[PDB]
């Protein structure tokens, strides 16, 4: 496993290669890199921070494709369990929920969540009614309209 | 009871009652002292249970009657539904009252450190006197909520630790209402004042029985400190 | 000004149901009206049964208290788990007068007030049935001379776990002196909410030995043996039988919330059941089809919504593996009984009457019948082994049954009745873009609201904070040129322009915005000033998620 | 170690209450009987902190010290050696 | 903070470390700029009326669509408790005056009278509040038997009101708007007992607000049962200009 390794010498190009393995554009990848540099030391296992940062941005950037296909989540989790050479899927979840606590308040994470409309996996137009306690909020009980149209196309083909 | 027992199985009855009184005195004089009222109460509590052990073999043998009713003369026998959140809040308040807050990170901290940080070393020397013999110390609300969160029973979107919602605070308010926890002020209490500090108000046997009702090992938390 | 008064009454000038139009506002108003009327029939049919159950609770409590009360010492009764809200009535039996004296810890600051209030109550009742007196125990001594009747006093100590036990011990020892008067008998009722052992160690051992001479225990909690909550749950089952169904998540949430409340979980159970019924009749446009008269009012919007049903999804996917017709199918396939409630009632009356299994909760029985584990619930008693094949039931996963269901997936029940209040406050403080929309446009995007920035700097600081250093840390994040451009964008206000002309303008603006947020944080309870006349350091009182 | 029944803690409570009632122990810093009825009435409307805590944590002080106990307990008494320190 | 954890009990224990004496800064307000009361007020109202006013107005327009749900909760006997970050004063006045009283008055056929308590005022007193409640509702006076023996006449009067109004038709006669139910004089136990016992009555609508993070510590099982709250988070980051003038700000 790469999450047990302590005090590793990370070049600046390995993080860009790991970000390009998850199709992150240049701004978010450079922000992950800069987030690594300002906490370069004070670090125990760099791979845990980089892995949590990359997957935390991955669920934000690709949140449109994660609502349509729930398999994408397992798929990306497994690519990660791989690039970290680990067979335990709870270590990756521990990594992302430990990195989320260090990134939940910054300005750039705020800009990313605003621009891709992520807000812990929710649109703003739903989360304002979850926070208000609306009776008329959208319930995850009925199928999505576009998902139902996609299924109707799948049975038409 | 004696008059129904003698038909179910005067001077002899007088000797039976007098021998019972003398046995009661010799069993419980150290417990009662020279107290007529307490010994009268013990005689009233133990006379029918002594009469029920009287058989045809036991009347003329006071020794055989004494061994027939030995358990009456060995112990005094003068005696007469809380929520899970309330029980764990009482346990956490007992811990907060009887453990110093400088060492809490050396008992409860279990998280993985992304950031380089040194946990607490722990206490060096044991105490000489058991601190549960003394009066409890006072604590703040957030310390009690910290220890309650650390000791309460339990993935990408779960966050399995229980946070302090309104049911926890309602249980804490009821616990103050029942005087199982107490404050520095007794009347006209500003609950929301930061100056107001809280202490446990139960003895160790009560918190022991409470911890035995929820299978929590509270004696493990005080074994290493004195 | 009305904003500066303590209180004021407003009679506002004025110039029809709270239900709104569903279906994206394409619902008709008459369907809104019959939604309202159907909600009221269900609510009334539930609450009439609930009121009858509550009256039965107080009736059997009165009967058990009177039976334990009337069938040279005290007659002591310990009501364990009592909220002290029971109205005790004594009998009317001739040649003797029976007085109930109720005493509260507020009415008991010392023994003298206890005796004075008790004797005033005694003399008031004895005068009210058929010359002034001294309100002490000699009135108990002279009661047969002054009234011609024997005396039976019943003392009801309300909320014993709040009283001073030294005062109560001295009052009981004082009441012991009335035993020699030959016409007086005294009953004591203690409403205990913790445990008998707690009140044992708070009293003297001689007082315990006095109370032990004649005492009984009577346990009446809100769910003593689950018998009264089972009636409320069964009446809710009957009011939605053949009409609505319960998910296992909702029953699981109900069991979890009733586990967290000790004395008042019956009203809590009724509260979440009524709030779920409210949420359904406010949310679902298909609730008009609860009544089988309204099925002819179908539309294209109704058929479009009901097509997105996972059970109907699996049904048509199985059909393709193996509108008018859809309308007839929807009409025909909502008729059936859904016999889970009848089977639950049958299992309940079979266990209660035949096997004499009485310490069961109907809610977990219904949960196990919902998840198909009624044998796994029944095999904990080792008495229905011969009837495991008799009471076997498996649910039928009927199609579009989630259009008529009470289910907890959105967390609306969690947000409304049991919110994570402190965590919601901290989450809104830390992540304010989930509160405020992302629409002086330049400043609103580049600089956060001051409370949120203050909480972000608050969270990452130590337990003790120097507020000058805290104010410098707050000042380094704010943009200087954009703030100075925003403050000069009001040309009508000349004092603002004059203050913006000063070279120390940004430090003053930062200090003003910092001090307003610091006093907001102090009022909310987040920070605590150390000394009264220093005001230089603060302590954090609040950490997020704990 | 060098046989007396060892009484349990639940039975020593009665002995402790008897010792308090016989004026051997006094509650710590207790005023006791007030000089006049006005101070006594003022004291009767206040709940003291000793009466709201459990009985095993109440602070007491002796009316008779160990040196006096050594002075008046006979030498033949079998608890005499513990009046020394 | 030189810490590894921020949130949860881990952050609580990790951020409360023994900082050394030499590490502590000695900075005070003597190195801070001096401001007057008037420029403080001027910058205060300018920022309150121009910084993020448009998102606050949009969000306030969003929360106004929940007013029929609030009215529906009030018709079933629940008391509304509004909490959040920012002032809820204008929200509670606008909901209870512009919306709730005319809707209730039209639904049971003058408008329903609204009594507004200001719990941010330290001089909010429960005896005068019950005097105006008595003036608005005209309850029957206690008899001599009901007065007990130096009993509290307010609480006994409300208990008489409770077992009187149990038989009346369920028509809302009074709206009780309590601003800052957690404020300095209202949070005391006698006032909370008074208001929870008034919340028992079906014919009084209770709309309340809280500001302290520890406000649910005020209510035990009896008080939470009598209050019968439905909670609503209406965080808006409102500046709280009215409530700030009841504390000494410039110190």
Residue numbers in the entry:
A (entry chain F): 271 to 427
B (entry chain E): 214 to 222, 229 to 299, 323 to 396, 407 to 478
C (entry chain C): 16 to 30, 38 to 93, 100 to 158, 179 to 370, 385 to 501, 510 to 616
D (entry chain D): 424 to 425, 447 to 529
E (entry chain B): 235 to 343, 356 to 497
Question: How does the study describe this entry?
Answer:
The coordinated action of multiple replicative helicase loading factors is needed for the licensing of replication origins prior to DNA replication. Binding of the Origin Recognition Complex (ORC) to DNA initiates the ATP-dependent recruitment of Cdc6, Cdt1 and Mcm2-7 loading, but the structural details for timely ATPase site regulation and for how loading can be impeded by inhibitory signals, such as cyclin-dependent kinase phosphorylation, are unknown.
In our cryo-EM structure of the ternary complex, Cdc6 is seen to complete the ORC ring as expected by binding in between Orc1 and Orc2. Both states also differ from the ring conformation seen in a loading intermediate containing DNA, ORC, Cdc6, Cdt1, and Mcm2-7 (OCCM), indicating this change in ring conformation may be linked to the functional ORC·Cdc6 cycle during Mcm2-7 loading. The second ATPase center in the ternary ScORC·DNA·Cdc6 complex at the interface between Orc1 and Cdc6 likewise appears to reside in a pre-hydrolysis state. A water molecule positioned for an in-line nucleophilic attack, however, is not seen. Intriguingly, Cdc6 binding to ScORC causes conformational rearrangements in the B-loop of Orc1 that help reorient the Orc1 arginine finger helix (with arginine finger R616) for completion of the Cdc6 ATPase site.
